[PDB]
Design a protein around this ligand. Structure first.
Ligand SMILES: [Br-]
Ligand SMILES: [Br-]
Ligand SMILES: [Cl-]
Ligand SMILES: [Cl-]
Ligand SMILES: [Cl-]
Ligand code: NA
Length: 204
């Protein structure tokens, strides 16, 4: 009744982008300032800063670079103060960082990796690929993933599989010919498939 702060929306954005923060303040005596703990962002070189306008509630987040294999989720807090020195609750804002190649709010393949970098070219040894599907960093269950050989000569065990409860779908690759092979994974919302790193089948 005297002073409240609400943050209606968390932030999901591309690494190194600037993201405006929406604050909703109600203050009987008048807002004086917002005070932030952004130490989680600063651990990776991001920050929360005033947008430079004349408004005491106009802030933005500078997102850090994406950390491969990292959390990429940053929890920061804001507290409003009024002109009498009262404060609001210390309110949580969650900032999730996506890599340059990913799309905010999309159900998309974020990772597509193989268990081996090489295999024998005997048409028998299998390289197993795992695709992870997330939306804003959260794994998505039961999503169909389409698999395709982009280049090279090989055979996929299947052309589509649905993700499990951990957001993962798998397929195997075999080849009778030596050479490099690139396999890709895609979900329906993506604009193009995500290529895995090349693997090589070797004669021996
Ligand atoms: Br809220
Ligand atoms: Br697809
Ligand atoms: Cl509050
Ligand atoms: Cl090998
Ligand atoms: Cl999708
Ligand atoms: Na919120």
């Amino acid at each position: 009744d005297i002073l409240s702060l609400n943050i209606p929306h968390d932030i999901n954005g591309t690494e190194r982008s600037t993201q405006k923060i929406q604050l909703i303040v109600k203050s009987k005596y008048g807002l004086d300032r917002i005070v932030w703990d952004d130490s989680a962002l600063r651990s990776q070189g991001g920050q929360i800063q005033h947008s430079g306008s004349q408004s005491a509630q106009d802030y933005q987040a500078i997102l850090p670079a994406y950390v491969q294999g990292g959390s990429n989720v940053y929890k920061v807090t804001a507290r409003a103060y009024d002109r009498n020195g009262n404060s609001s609750n210390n309110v949580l804002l969650t900032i999730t960082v996506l890599s340059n190649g990913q799309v905010v709010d999309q159900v998309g393949v974020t990772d597509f990796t193989a268990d081996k970098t090489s295999a024998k070219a005997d048409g028998t040894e299998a390289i197993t690929y795992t695709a992870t599907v997330k939306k804003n960093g959260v794994a998505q269950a039961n999503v169909p993933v389409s698999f395709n050989i982009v280049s090279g000569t090989a055979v996929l065990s299947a052309n589509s599989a649905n993700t499990n409860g951990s957001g993962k779908a798998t397929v195997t690759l075999k080849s009778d010919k030596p050479g490099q092979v690139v396999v890709s994974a895609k979900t329906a919302e993506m604009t193009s498939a995500l290529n895995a790193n090349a693997v090589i089948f070797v004669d021996q």
